Every structure is written in structure tokens, then in C-alpha cells.
């Protein structure tokens, strides 16, 4: 709803790593800290779906700035190293690249096409915000 609290697909929730508590993580079905991403159960009848498709453009919330922008973005691939205080100066993986504004709190703010939910707000700063590609966690939705 809001579109900042993570993806709720079925049974389970997909968010960010850093951004993910000790019990989720105990509990968590997928994880992967390069992507920046876990997917763990949740007693809860989500209502987003994953978008099966290869949209080169979407819509993301920015959080600090209260409105919805729509961005064009570089397909998934590995990104520079980049360093922020939940994590070093690191490659990420399935990282989606686009021009706007991001902010520290805004993490997590989800990107959307008419397909459904593409990737998950991961960092940013300077006029440019990078988001972890879902798409291949279709299997979700069963
Ligand atoms: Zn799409």
C-alpha cells in the first residue's frame, strides 16, 4: 500500500538485508547479502505480485520527498563498489540503475510497472538510486 515496507507476495515478505531483523533472518526461506535481499514467511495474504517480465522503465516511491517517480533503469548486473554504514565498500548483485532522488531512509521503497513489483530500493545518493532486481524470485508466487 504505503510502498515502502518491503514486498508481501502470498505467505512471505521480500526486503532488503540490512534492513531485515534477527527472527525474519532465522526464519528466512531465500537470503542473499549481495543482491541485498531476503525473501521469509509472514501469517499474511499478501497483495503484491512479482512482474514476470523485462520492463526497462518503472515507478518508485522516495519516501524523505513523500511522491512517486517514474525512472528509466539499466537492466540487473553487478555494480561498483560502493559503501554504506550497514555494509563495506562491496559489488552488489541484480542491481538496477536509475537517475532520481534517494535518500538514507528511503530503503526499501519499491519499484513497480504494470507487471507488477520489480526490485526493492537499495541506496542511492546524488541524484542516482539503485534497486535489487526480484524478478528472478517469480517462484514466490506458486
Ligand atoms: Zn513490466
Redesign the pocket.
Known sequence: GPGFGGVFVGSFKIINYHLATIEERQSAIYVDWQSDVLVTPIAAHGRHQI?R???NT?VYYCRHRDKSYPVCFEGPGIQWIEQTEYYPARYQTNVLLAAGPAEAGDCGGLLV????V?GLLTAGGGGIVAFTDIRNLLWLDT
Do not use: D, R
Open positions: 512482474a517480465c523485462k520492463c518503472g510497472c504494470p507487471h507488477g520489480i
